[PDB]
């Protein structure tokens, strides 16, 4: 069906424009095509060795738009999706190295870590639960911090790009250098991978009830440490983990600053380009209205519509 790869050259060139005007707009219209789009862009960009450009820039514009800082990347966007996909594609081995040992431990344990007095059973000894939890954590966090350098260079560079973006935006706010990184590597990678191990195929067994609940307590502990938050003013009953938090904060900061410090950047695509065009055609109308607005993209979005129309024509002539 689809046209030879040559047919899309002008198209590809526009997509790959540094300003990413096309991609920005597509980030607006996709809606429920969001995964599919993300999926295609990444394949294209990776094929061009320009993933960094894609993700740094697109993450950069989302920081630009934010204004409010404790909401950044907290919702779903195309940017969040790209990152999720790029991280599955390139950071699975990192997740296995850092997490597998302790996840396996937790599965095959049979002792409870339950702290909430309401969930405790008859005769169940909260003192032991806490000791079991703190130990699991101690080990896990060791393995995490010691995979600081196993994370591939390009992802780290992208985390670097994140640090420089919130720098420019919030130069005086001295928290965001690490938080912006925490949100991807913990909230959107490690903590899920602990919660749901099947995520990165660590184990494919449904946890026992307790293992299920342990992974949750653990991830809560790790996300709190990741955020630098001591328990007590939220859930009451997690006070007993604050020593773990208090003794690991400095290491969590180091880990989150270091992780981004890399400022040196380290087949036929007609299938992918065809499909991206298909999405442009589909959101053809929403694309017009975005090129009715001024600013420096308008130029480019109008060239887009041209090519979108033009390509659809060429495909009809191909049609039988």
């Amino acid at each position: 069906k689809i046209m030879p790869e040559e047919e899309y050259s002008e198209f590809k060139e526009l997509i790959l424009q540094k300003e990413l005007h096309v991609v920005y707009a597509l980030s607006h219209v996709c809606g429920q095509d969001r995964t599919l789009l993300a999926s295609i862009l990444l394949r294209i960009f990776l094929h061009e060795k320009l993933e960094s450009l894609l993700l740094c820039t697109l993450n950069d514009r989302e920081i630009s738009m934010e204004d409010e800082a404790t909401t950044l990347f907290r919702a779903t966007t195309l940017a969040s999706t790209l990152m999720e996909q790029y991280m599955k594609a390139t950071a699975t081995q990192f997740v296995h190295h850092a997490l597998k040992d302790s996840i396996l431990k937790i599965m095959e344990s049979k002792q409870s870590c339950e702290l909430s007095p309401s969930k405790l059973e008859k005769n169940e000894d909260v003192n032991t639960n806490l000791t079991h939890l703190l130990n699991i954590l101690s080990e896990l966090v060791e393995k995490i911090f010691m995979a600081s350098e196993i994370l591939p260079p390009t992802l780290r560079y992208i985390y670097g790009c994140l640090q420089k973006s919130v720098q420019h935006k919030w130069p005086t706010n001295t928290t965001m250098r690490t938080r912006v990184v925490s949100g991807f590597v913990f909230l959107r990678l490690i903590c899920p991978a602990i919660l749901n191990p099947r995520m990165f195929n660590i184990i494919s067994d449904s946890p026992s009830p307790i293992a299920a609940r342990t992974l949750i307590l653990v991830a809560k502990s790790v996300q709190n440490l990741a955020n630098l938050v001591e328990f007590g003013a939220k859930e009451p009953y997690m006070e007993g983990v604050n020593p773990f938090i208090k003794s690991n904060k400095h290491r969590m900061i180091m880990f989150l600053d270091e992780l981004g410090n890399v400022p040196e950047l380290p087949t036929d695509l007609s299938r992918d380009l065809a499909a991206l065009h298909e999405i442009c055609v589909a959101h053809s109308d929403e694309l017009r209205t975005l090129s009715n607005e001024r600013g420096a993209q308008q130029h480019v979005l109008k060239k887009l519509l041209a090519i979108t129309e033009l390509l659809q024509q060429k495909q009809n002539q191909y049609t039988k």
């Binding site: 919702a75 949750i216 859930e235």
Partner: protein, 166 residues
């Protein structure tokens, strides 16, 4: 004294935790503390009937969407939160409504649509169109601020009614 198993759902950053903490602890704090899964209990009188609230505050980041099937099967009421300054948060309400209606396999399912952050000048979402979504779901719509204590007792307390009168 029965006890209702409320579940607070919606997109990341919409104020699900701020709502729960305004309810449970009766103060506010702007901060960065994304949730994985927190649980709270609070005994309260509504209508003159003293009951106990069992509130599950959730993570609304995509990579936690496997968690929901669980929290939905066991939950009795669903507080579906969006941010009145964020239209994306608003469209994400559809995901939730439609899974809740499979796992429970009912179009009637106690639920309240919440328009939080109403204290802010930058509405991208008009009561009207929220009013309507809610009216079309056959559920109440309640605007809130966790910042100001506004609409909060209202929002939890309505969802309790939804379960009783269900």
């Amino acid at each position: 004294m029965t006890e209702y198993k409320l579940v607070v759902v919606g997109a990341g950053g919409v104020g699900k935790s701020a709502l729960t903490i305004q309810l449970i602890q009766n103060h506010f704090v702007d901060e960065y503390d994304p949730t994985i899964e927190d649980s709270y209990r609070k005994q309260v009188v509504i209508d003159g009937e003293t009951c106990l609230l069992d509130i599950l505050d959730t993570a609304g980041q995509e990579e936690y969407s496997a968690m929901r099937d669980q929290y939905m099967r066991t939950g009795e009421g669903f507080l579906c939160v969006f941010a009145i300054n964020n239209t994306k948060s608003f469209e994400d309400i559809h995901q939730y409504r439609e899974q809740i209606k499979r796992v429970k396999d009912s179009d009637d399912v106690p639920m309240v649509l919440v328009g939080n952050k109403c204290d802010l000048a930058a509405r991208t979402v008009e009561s009207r169109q929220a009013q309507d979504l809610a009216r079309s779901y056959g559920i109440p719509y309640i605007e809130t601020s966790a910042k100001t204590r506004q609409g909060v007792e209202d929002a939890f307390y309505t969802l309790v009614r939804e379960i009783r009168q269900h």
